[PDB]
Symmetry: C3
Subunit: 403 residues, 3 copies
């Protein structure tokens, strides 16, 4: 029944089937080799790992009665996704036409891949079952891997910090999915689509770990040590500038000049997304400050004006405002990456192909999102009703100390 | 008086005596030497350090009115324990028959030793005074050091991630202690032996830092870089698989298919414990996925069925269900370590001695737990009454903003 | 109007002006170079980065209705401060009489500089607007840079962990500022100048990340690997001993022997501050244990007896008791640094100049604090009234789920 949110058969079936398949496929394909890349790369892996599980995980706990599902479903989707990503990204790097040799570099890329699903989760947060999220993860990891392969291998595009492959891709995939999953009577749940004091403090845990570790995120897969150092510092600068302009615009747009925690939790991160592609390329930090400057402003304007417009007029219900953080700043990051790439004819042509990568990313996000959206819209997955969204009690036993 | 929980003389006396003794013993024995092991090992130290103080610390804050004592007593017991561990573990490595030369490697092992006490704390949490915890730490660190010496030095057993030396040892020591400390009327406090919404979110801080950093935990003291890399990735895999099966079984065992935060906070960590010994030995990741697969299932079944049975029929009151996370998966880890070790005659004999190490660990945990249990049962230490357990107000001034 | 806390023009103006100036000055002066210092130093940078944004940020969230402003204003002041510090500290290291070449070492020092402002923020927390904090940061970063230059370059003083340059300087600057900003009717807000249960748990996030990462804080800029290793372990020891004596004295001073979370959150950190200067110099760990031993006691006595006395008799309103953590232990750290430095004539003279550095730091903190205090006291900045302190609602839109 379409009203049945009882997942006692379906969720275990989905989890166990997926995990058995992971076991079989690891047995067939995945192997180990027999100073280290471990020592020089593991620290970057850990920072990205924290951003996925604690950064995105707690960021989404701002919802007053959706904290368990935010951190807990993120935990679940990412635990599955990292395994499936190792395989999908792996298959584009077979050794002996049949082995995926895994090292720390594979783990780093698997977490980046999953980060795109954490982005998409932000659009549909509160309105989808954990079964829908696992199905989304299954298809989105595949699509991410194919898009990444087209960009990095076929088009020879550079995108170290994933403004295109992670943020633009994840955002517009997520937003396409959420549009297909449009809920006409979502206002029936709107009393829970907000924060309470304590949930905004938990969410700042997420914000701060993303913001602090983003310089590793953007530098982890830069190749030369020289560009890695530059990627990190440019990201650090862009993020710093983003905080001041996000705060400035949050205040400016409020009638009493008061700040809004949605802006401080989310718009302050836009400078990280926007230098994903360019951070490793920019020879001077002042440009990174400008990117952070502009994107804090644009992100905050997006939350205030664009989100309500897109929901009202275009039927895009975007719980975490991922369009304002990952989407628009992702596209900006892609464009700035192209311009920075172009700065002889070989430079000019690199610039054009960076743009090709952006357009390919968007096409894949749209087409992929339509397909996955339509699958997720089927009434089989235990999704809640329009008046039961943003409510943990639908999928969790609620604490005994409360009830 | 046995009803007197006023620690104004006894707690300061205990803290100051212990710390003065640490000062004297450091003065006599502890010295420094006069790329670096600092650079290559300090990062692993920090990850383990976080798991001890923030991981276990916040994990135990799920108790609705025991958050201060959970994080705060963990802080206190570990601050003492790391110092005493440096000495106890140190004495088994005298230089010049009388000096303990400390480097980062000593700090790593001291934190591992204390992790075993954090495990044991999980069984007695809410029912013991901070004085009892310091006394427990004093004796348990000593017992840990002797057990570790027997296993690693005398039996030449391998246990990089401590499935035996930390988890099995800590769990069955803790459970033996809690059995001796059995409280006939504990149901009088049962209204506080649970979570509220916000305490389950704080506890997820603990869960996630343990889960994310466990790959360092299991690889920190692996010797070759080759096995270290393998230890980390096998742990990462086992933990991933553990989340999916823990979630599957939590749902399956609920009448409405709903998830339980006790399972998501604790059973999701069982795959880390279970590959402690084998992670560095397993040449293929698919085996690690299987270990995580099985242990998520077993851990969750333990929480639902074994914990109530052991409390009902065997009088084992296990606050954090450490038997389900550290105990059974610890023994499994020890057994899988033996089988993996055995996979010529030298391999076969290594296998048998791994099993000897498991049996020795259990014997030490039982005998040590009986002795320490009986000391802790003495009415001198300011332990609370059966109707005043899981209540911070017994040992803390409660916030002025509330009262 | 002096009663006008509406920052809709003033806060955006302040943020945008400051950030545009940062952009211009980075464009003129700041450049990049064209194994790595990145690899060996970035990890230490990250630990310090976490201490600034999450450590100090969450530490100050103990205030029951000031959690947003504590973590959020810290975020804002530090985001500005790191940029301005890169410039101010940079100008004392021009290349080509006009370029600041930034690497990871610059980022580490910029975060240390900002840490001093996080300290000062602790005195004025709850009673100053975000505009006052940005103005304070602007001047305090400049003063920090000049004081650091006098000490390190002109006086050839050693202070790796900043007992003088960060803690003593920050504390007495902050306390001078707060004295000039004395509020006669602050008791009108005293119902919010306290914690609730959940705010004390958030604050422990801050406490624990400071405590765990402090060994990196104190070793990050030690030059030789030998002294770095020593700085870290001495800090680890001092902090451990500090917890036991802080707990002992918290209990001893309570009529019922109960612990106070103010002491466990703050006094437990005093051993880190007190070995800032000496940690890299002390050849034996037992001395570090003694410093932590004494400073836990002194810090806790300060919270109980000195804070109320200084507020009552000397009109020093110190929200976070920074005198007890950063001030007195900072001066102790400076004194122990001198004695440790002195332990031939060249050693003796180093000792005297360490003391000169302490006296210069205090003079700069006082003079600088008077000037900045008087500027901040002007009624232009949107500071709240005496009955509206420690209240987020003054500067933030409050969560919709509550209102
Ligand atoms: C969001 C759009 C803002 C405009 C982009 C910021 C300016 C680009 O930054 C550029 O960095 C280069 C480093 O390679 C410098 O050579 C250029 O002078 C600088 O303009
Ligand atoms: C919890 C018990 C589950 C059974 C143990 C998991 C299977 C052991 O994993 C083993 O790893 C080895 C790597 O050295 C491989 O060679 C073996 O093929 C594989 O079975
Ligand atoms: C807070 C004041 C407490 C007194 C200071 C602690 C003692 C100083 O510690 C000193 O460390 C030296 C290492 O260089 C040792 O040589 C000395 O024996 C030891 O006393």
């Amino acid at each position: 029944s379409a009203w049945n949110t009882n997942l006692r058969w379906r969720l275990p079936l989905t989890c166990l089937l997926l995990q058995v398949i992971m076991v079989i496929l690891f047995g067939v394909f995945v192997r180990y080799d027999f100073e280290n890349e471990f020592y020089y790369r593991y620290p970057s892996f850990q920072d990205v790992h924290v951003m996925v599980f604690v950064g995105f995980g707690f960021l989404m706990t701002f919802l007053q009665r959706y904290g368990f599902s935010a951190v807990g479903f993120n935990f679940l989707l990412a635990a599955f996704g990292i395994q499936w990503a190792l395989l999908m990204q792996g298959w584009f790097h077979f050794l002996q036409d049949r082995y995926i040799v895994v090292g720390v570099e594979n783990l780093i890329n698997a977490d980046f891949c999953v980060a795109s699903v954490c982005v998409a989760f932000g659009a549909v947060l509160g309105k989808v079952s954990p079964i829908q999220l696992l199905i989304m993860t299954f298809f989105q990891v595949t699509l991410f891997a194919v898009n990444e392969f087209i960009l990095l291998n076929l088009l020879k595009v550079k995108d170290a910090g994933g403004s295109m492959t992670i943020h633009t891709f994840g955002a517009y995939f997520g937003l396409t999915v959420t549009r297909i999953l449009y809920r006409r009577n979502l206002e029936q749940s709107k009393e829970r689509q907000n924060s309470v004091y304590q949930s905004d403090l938990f969410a700042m845990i997420g914000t701060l770990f993303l913001w602090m570790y983003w310089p590793s995120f953007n530098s982890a897969i830069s190749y030369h040590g020289d560009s890695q150092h530059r990627a990190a510092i440019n990201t650090y600068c862009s993020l710093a500038a983003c905080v001041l302009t996000s705060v400035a615009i949050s205040s400016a747009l409020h009638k009493k000049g008061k700040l809004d925690m949605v802006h401080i939790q989310n718009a302050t991160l836009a400078g990280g997304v926007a230098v994903g592609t360019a951070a490793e390329m920019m020879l001077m930090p002042y440009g990174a400050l400008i990117i952070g400057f502009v994107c804090g402003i644009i992100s905050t304007l997006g939350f205030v004006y664009l989100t309500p417009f897109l929901e009202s007029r275009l039927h895009i219900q975007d719980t975490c405002g991922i369009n304002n953080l990952h989407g628009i700043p992702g596209i900006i990051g892609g464009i700035v990456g192209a311009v920075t790439a172009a700065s002889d004819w070989t430079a000019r042509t690199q610039g054009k192909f960076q743009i090709y990568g952006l357009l390919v990313t968007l096409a894949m996000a749209l087409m992929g999102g339509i397909i996955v959206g339509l699958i997720l819209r089927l009434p089989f997955w235990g999704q809640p009703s329009d008046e039961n969204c943003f409510e943990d009690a639908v999928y969790w036993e609620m604490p005994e100390g409360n009830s």
